[PDB]
Amino acid sequence: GRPWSAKENKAFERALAVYDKDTPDRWANVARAVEGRTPEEVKKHYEILVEDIKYIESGKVPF
């Protein structure tokens, strides 16, 4: 399954809205709603989103 589809991503984005940054077990709640994606897979997707925004804002990939 590995790369994310358009529709997986849209679901992911909806899930970030329903389960806010304060939600405990945030990735597990998000992954439960995103069919066929594990908590750690969902956590990695978020990290890549954060890094992408950081690159856009600064012009350097974060480490």
Side-chain angles (χ1 to χ4, degrees), residues 45-58 62:
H45 203 59
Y46 186 74
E47 291 172 337
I48 282 157
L49 176 64
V50 175
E51 294 174 5
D52 272 346
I53 296 169
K54 288 194 190 149
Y55 171 72
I56 292 167
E57 290 178 338
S58 78

Side-chain angles (χ1 to χ4, degrees), residues 14-20 22-51:
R14 292 190 291 264
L16 295 182
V18 171
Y19 300 120
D20 83 3
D22 298 307
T23 316
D25 305 311
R26 192 188 192 191
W27 312 122
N29 278 297
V30 171
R32 173 170 55 187
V34 182
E35 229 65 337
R37 288 292 172 179
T38 70
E40 293 80 0
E41 267 186 302
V42 143
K43 174 179 161 85
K44 174 175 162 195
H45 203 59
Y46 186 74
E47 291 172 337
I48 282 157
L49 176 64
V50 175
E51 294 174 5

